[PDB]
Amino acid sequence: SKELLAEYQDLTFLTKQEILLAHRRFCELLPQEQRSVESSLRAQVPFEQILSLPELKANPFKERICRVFSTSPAKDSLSFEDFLDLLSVFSDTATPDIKSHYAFRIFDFDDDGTLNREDLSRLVNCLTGEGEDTRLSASEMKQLIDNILEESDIDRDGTINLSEFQHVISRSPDFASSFKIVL
């Protein structure tokens, strides 16, 4: 199931939490004997259930919306992938972020899903001491890593996951230029 859901993460640039929330909603819109993770990811939700979606309530052309997001020309339904895109457009519970996705993968050296002290050390090391061309000392690197955890490691597990990473660089507009965190 982890590998299966992970595929969608690479396809949409959403966090695992976002995909999980969406998957639960998707399943609840399918037929009872369809909830099976691997089974559900192959099912399609009929427009009936999409039209009554809360985030589409105030939208005119709901019928049009369904047809545009639907990938299968034959059927009048949405696949899980189509559903993710719908939520990315109409719901605050799904916000694609291609920059966070790749930046995270770059610093997650062992590709294990989180940024630990070691991964974070390279991240903060992209910054400078004080002058325009400086390099951090051990203690400065330590403090910077400590500050990131203290401020963004909200599930207090000692690492930074994609969701938390998005918060770490949420105030760094030019982050991708040289991977510098603001402050």
Residue 155 labeled ligand binder: yes
- The neighbour count for residue 98, using CB atoms within 10 Å, is 9
Q: Is 146 in the site for Ca ion (CB under 5 A)?
A: no
From the list 157, 170, 171, 176, which residue makes contact with Ca ion (rule: CB under 5 A)? Answer: 157
Residue 160 — φ and ψ, nearest 5°? -120, 120
For residue 27, the minimal CB distance to Ca ion (Å) is 20
Residue 153 labeled ligand binder: yes
For residue 117, the minimal CB distance to Ca ion (Å) is 10
Long-range contact list for 162-169, CB < 8 A, 24+ apart? 162/15, 162/16, 162/100, 162/101, 162/104, 162/113, 163/15, 163/16, 163/17, 165/100, 165/103, 165/104, 165/115, 166/15, 166/97, 166/100, 169/100, 169/103
Q: What is the DSSP letter of 113?
A: S
Piece of the chain touching Ca ion by CB under 5 A; list 48-56, 69-77, 139-147, 151-159: 151-159
Which lies closer to Ca ion via its Cβ, residue 37 or residue 89? 89
Q: Among 133, 124, 135, 140, which Cα is nearest to 172's? A: 124
Which lies closer to Ca ion via its Cβ, residue 97 or residue 108? 108
Residues 75-114 that bind Ca ion (CB under 5 A): 88, 94-95, 108, 110, 112
For residue 75, the minimal CB distance to Ca ion (Å) is 25
Residue ranges binding Ca ion (CB under 5 A): 88, 94-95, 108, 110, 112, 119, 153, 155, 157
> Binding site membership for Ca(2+): which residues?
108, 110, 112, 114, 119, 153, 155, 157, 159, 164
